Amino acid sequence: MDAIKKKMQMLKLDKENALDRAEQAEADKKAAEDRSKQLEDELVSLQKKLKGTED
Amino acid sequence: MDAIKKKMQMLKLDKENALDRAEQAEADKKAAEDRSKQLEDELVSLQKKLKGTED
């Protein structure tokens, strides 16, 4: 009819916005966790270098 | 009718799924970010003690 189509369009705009936000948040999590794990690896290498210096 | 109900329910389900997924991702992002901050703070002190050891 008439109002039904507009209501469907609203329900679809919510769909697109929610899905896009979810995908963006997932990409953010991937990037942040990669950052953290690379920092942890750098910390490990520093520990090993400290061990060599102690020797 | 029949089509309106199923389509509307499926679209609302899609919106809710995307929203909850985004919230989970953002929570993990915040936790990883704070842990990364902890890693930075500990790494600086590790570098300082390494520098003293080298001196």
Place this chain on the structure above:
Amino acid sequence: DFDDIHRKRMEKDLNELQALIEAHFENRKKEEEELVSLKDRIERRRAERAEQQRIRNER
């Protein structure tokens, strides 16, 4: 944000659209009521034509 104003805009769009939807609902509903009354007076006309035709045929 831009998402906020976009949301308010599609929101008022949904509001005006459902408003006009219920509006034409009411309009076509009045038209259907008028058409039903038309059918009713039509059946009245059928019955009156039937009885007067039958009287004519009786005579």
